[PDB]
Design a protein around this ligand. Structure first.
Ligand code: AKG
Ligand code: MN
Length: 221
């Protein structure tokens, strides 16, 4: 039922059939002119919009997701345009997305394997800009599968990897959101067999945050 409910009829021509349920990959979701304008607006944002992490830089737009409730911020039109385009595919349970995470990866930067978790409706939509990357998928270790007497097992390798080209839309739903981990290796090149050199990548991850505080209300803790 999880897989059945996760299907989006309008995107079925874009289903990645050999990947876990349910992954869509739409090439050329945005034009080169649209890509250029998004890069310009990310790069020209006020310095304080940027957060420096150990292995990448990012921007939050729409507010900072939090388990006690998100304090919302108005999305600017240059992002709302694409929030509207992905929300029109009805990817977020029948309410529009309300949050954009911008990640910037210089060549050699990535993101450790993770699941996006319960702060979001269980759907990732990502518009890639600037450079290709490879997104790796891993089977999680579930507590119900824990065997403290198991034979030696090789270090985890990805179960599937997907090339993400600039101007593509990626959608992860069902088990691809709730069961699998995804990550990007800290690499300068991706061998397909032939081989792609990474430039700077900027990704726009568009999600719906269901726990939002009314305008003006703060929670401590
Ligand atoms: O940059 C990407 O496409 C993935 C980012 C991501 O997985 C995340 O920020 O949760
Ligand atoms: Mn993620």
């Amino acid at each position: 039922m999880e897989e059945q409910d996760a299907r989006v009829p309008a995107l079925e021509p874009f289903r990645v059939e050999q990947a876990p349920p349910v992954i869509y990959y739409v090439p050329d979701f945005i034009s080169k002119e649209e890509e250029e304008y998004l890069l310009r607006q990310v790069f020209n944002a006020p310095k304080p919009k940027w957060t420096q992490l150990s292995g990448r830089k990012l921007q939050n737009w729409g507010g900072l997701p939090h388990p006690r409730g998100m304090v919302p911020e108005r999305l600017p039109p240059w992002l709302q345009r694409y929030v509207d385009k992905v929300s029109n595919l009805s990817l977020f349970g029948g309410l529009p997305a309300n949050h954009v995470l911008v990640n910037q990866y210089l060549p050699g930067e990535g993101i450790m394997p993770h699941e996006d978790g319960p702060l979001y409706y269980p759907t990732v939509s990502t518009i890639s800009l600037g450079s290709h990357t490879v997104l790796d998928f891993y089977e999680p270790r579930r507590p119900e599968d824990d065997d403290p007497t198991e034979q030696p097992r090789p270090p985890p390798r990805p179960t599937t990897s997907l090339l993400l080209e600039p101007r593509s839309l990626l959608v992860l739903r069902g088990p691809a959101y709730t069961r699998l981990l995804h990550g990007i290796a800290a690499a300068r090149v991706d061998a397909l067999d032939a081989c792609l050199v990474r430039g700077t990548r900027v990704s726009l991850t568009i999600r719906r945050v269901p726990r939002v505080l009314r305008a003006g209300l703060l929670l401590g803790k």
